[PDB]
Amino acid sequence: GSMKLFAQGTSLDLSHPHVMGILNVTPNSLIDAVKHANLMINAGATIIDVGGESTRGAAEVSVEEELQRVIPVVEAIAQRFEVWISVDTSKPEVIRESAKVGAHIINDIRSLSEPGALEAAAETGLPVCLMHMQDVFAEVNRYFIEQIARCEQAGIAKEKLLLDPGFGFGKNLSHNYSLLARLAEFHHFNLPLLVGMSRKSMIGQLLNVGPSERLSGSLACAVIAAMQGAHIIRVHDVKETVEAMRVVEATLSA
Amino acid sequence: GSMKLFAQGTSLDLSHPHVMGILNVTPDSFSDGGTHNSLIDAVKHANLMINAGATIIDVGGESTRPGAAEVSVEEELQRVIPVVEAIAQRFEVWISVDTSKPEVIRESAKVGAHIINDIRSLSEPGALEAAAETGLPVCLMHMYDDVFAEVNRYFIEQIARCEQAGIAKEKLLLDPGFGFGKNLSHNYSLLARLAEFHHFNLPLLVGMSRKSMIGQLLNVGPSERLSGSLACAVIAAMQGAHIIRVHDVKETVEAMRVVEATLSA
Numbered sequence: 001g002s003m004k005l006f007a008q009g010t011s012l013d014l015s016h017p018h019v020m021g022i023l024n025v026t027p028n029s030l031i032d033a034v035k036h037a038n039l040m041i042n043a044g045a046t047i048i049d050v051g052g053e054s055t056r057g058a059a060e061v062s063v064e065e066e067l068q069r070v071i072p073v074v075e076a077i078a079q080r081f082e083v084w085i086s087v088d089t090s091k092p093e094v095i096r097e098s099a100k101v102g103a104h105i106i107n108d109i110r111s112l113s114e115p116g117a118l119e120a121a122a123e124t125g126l127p128v129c130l131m132h133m134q135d136v137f138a139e140v141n142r143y144f145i146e147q148i149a150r151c152e153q154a155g156i157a158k159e160k161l162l163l164d165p166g167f168g169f170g171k172n173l174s175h176n177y178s179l180l181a182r183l184a185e186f187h188h189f190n191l192p193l194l195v196g197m198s199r200k201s202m203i204g205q206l207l208n209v210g211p212s213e214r215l216s217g218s219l220a221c222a223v224i225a226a227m228q229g230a231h232i233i234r235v236h237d238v239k240e241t242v243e244a245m246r247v248v249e250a251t252l253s254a
Numbered sequence: 255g256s257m258k259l260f261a262q263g264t265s266l267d268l269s270h271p272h273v274m275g276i277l278n279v280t281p282d283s284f285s286d287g288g289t290h291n292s293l294i295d296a297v298k299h300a301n302l303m304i305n306a307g308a309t310i311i312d313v314g315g316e317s318t319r320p321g322a323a324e325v326s327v328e329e330e331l332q333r334v335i336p337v338v339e340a341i342a343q344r345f346e347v348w349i350s351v352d353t354s355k356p357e358v359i360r361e362s363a364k365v366g367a368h369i370i371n372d373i374r375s376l377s378e379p380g381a382l383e384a385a386a387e388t389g390l391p392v393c394l395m396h397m398y399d400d401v402f403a404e405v406n407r408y409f410i411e412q413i414a415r416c417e418q419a420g421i422a423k424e425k426l427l428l429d430p431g432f433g434f435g436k437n438l439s440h441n442y443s444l445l446a447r448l449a450e451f452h453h454f455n456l457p458l459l460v461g462m463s464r465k466s467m468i469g470q471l472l473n474v475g476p477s478e479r480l481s482g483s484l485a486c487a488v489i490a491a492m493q494g495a496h497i498i499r500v501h502d503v504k505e506t507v508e509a510m511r512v513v514e515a516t517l518s519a
């Protein structure tokens with residue numbers, strides 16, 4: 001409520017939930033990527049998440065490959081749209097170059113653990129998402145305390161930080177649901193909360209359904225998180241999620 | 255695991271949410287006594303909903319679409335009773351009946367219905383007495399200076415009305431009546447404050463599926479309301495609503511399982 005992020009001279013208003021559309025650029029191709037961004041923006045996404053290294057035992061990519069895949073897409077979106085852009089990268093060089101071409105958020109699932117990443121993040125002055133990876137609530141909470149301190153000591157202001165409990169990523173079904181159930185408790189940090197549950201195995205394993213059959217469970221997870229005041233919901237299916245968020249917003253507004 | 259209803263020799267365990275599938279057997283859906291096999295049609299639909307995980311099937315034979323002509327007692331009996339009977343014979347689900355008529359209430363009970371779900375809360379002549387005589391669970395549905403306070407007060411008065419007629423409190427369900435003389439603001443206030451209705455310690459039943467409170471908010475037509483419906487169902491269920499009345503059972507059941515896994519933790 002009046003919580004805000006600032007980047008690239010603009011601001012993101014976190015008094016309501018935002019839907020972050022996933023834009024996978026691990027598979028002309030530039031134009032495809034931009035058209036996909038266009039669909040997600042038209043569906044109501046207010047942040048577009050660009051990732052160029054796959055996270056499925058998928059192949060690692062070099063610095064050079066990630067630069068070649070990610071940077072042109074970030075740049076083309078900054079030139080076409082007034083939308084926030086997040087980049088999924090662990091690599092110092094990608095962090096620095098993303099900021100130069102107009103990215104708003106560094107979204108590192110490794111929370112800046114690669115050598116030089118922390119320094120690169122601090123130098124950009126960008127918002128940074130910290131994700132917990134592989135009492136679960138106490139473990140994740142402790143992890144947040146440690147990463148905030150780690151970032152503060154590197155010169156990164158607390159107001160630049162976003163927190164993500166890391167659904168999936170070395171977590172069993174019980175552990176995923178405990179985190180979901182207690183998500184609101186993470187507000188004690190007074191930081192933005194970002195969650196990614198879309199199509200995850202915490203739904204697949206619960207319902208015994210494959211990746212393409214997880215829409216309803218995804219929507220349920222998003223609504224549960226948003227009703228607990230999560231700020232950013234990272235999803236594959238933007239339109240459906242945005243419609244769900246409008247129902248949440250009408251409820252919370254009342 | 256705690257709160258329960260009893261009817262027809264079985265019990266409904268309300269320690270977790272139940273999905274109630276809508277089965278419309280009114281003139282808007284099917285002929286009665288015509289060439290079409292409406293009975294088999296109705297039962298196949300019930301079967302799909304049960305296979306999708308519905309644990310209650312809501313059967314209604316009188317239309318309540320704005321234009322719709324009222325049906326005779328005989329026609330309503332002919333539409334509803336065969337369907338109630340067929341489900342009570344075949345499937346291990348509860349059956350709710352949507353009727354305001356004393357005769358349909360009495361006959362439904364005889365052939366195996368578990369819940370009387372009257373949107374008129376038994377206000378028709380004879381309905382209250384017929385409901386009491388059956389011994390069945392009864393749903394009370396509301397149909398402003400303050401909408402929450404008006405619905406709350408309505409509940410207090412109808413519970414007392416039912417009690418005075420010999421219906422035990424342990425047979426009662428409460429439904430705030432989404433879309434029932436209610437604009438967008440009113441619908442969302444009731445949804446936001448749903449948990450406050452637990453003070454009565456009674457089952458909460460809600461029906462938002464495909465309603466205008468979604469359609470008008472999102473500017474989507476009746477066949478495109480699934481996401482908004484799911485969101486409503488989840489918001490209600492996270493607030494401990496007991497029964498969710500829906501058209502799209504499979505998706506709702508999936509959503510409830512996510513809720514149950516969350517609440518359990």
Ligand SMILES: Cn1nc(CNc2nnn[nH]2)c(=O)c2c(=O)[nH]c(N)nc21
Nearest residue numbers: 055056088107129131164166167194196
């Ligand atoms: C950038 N990113 N990517 C994924 C992709 N799914 C995955 N990757 N590795 N294993 N599964 C993701 O899930 C998330 C998440 O959950 N949170 C946050 N902040 N960023 C994520």
Ligand SMILES: Cn1nc(CNc2nnn[nH]2)c(=O)c2c(=O)[nH]c(N)nc21
Nearest residue numbers: 318352371373393395429431432459461
């Ligand atoms: C039996 N029934 N039927 C409807 C159909 N929708 C409607 N009827 N009239 N105007 N709109 C309904 O919405 C509900 C509801 O919401 N709750 C409960 N307990 N029973 C309902």
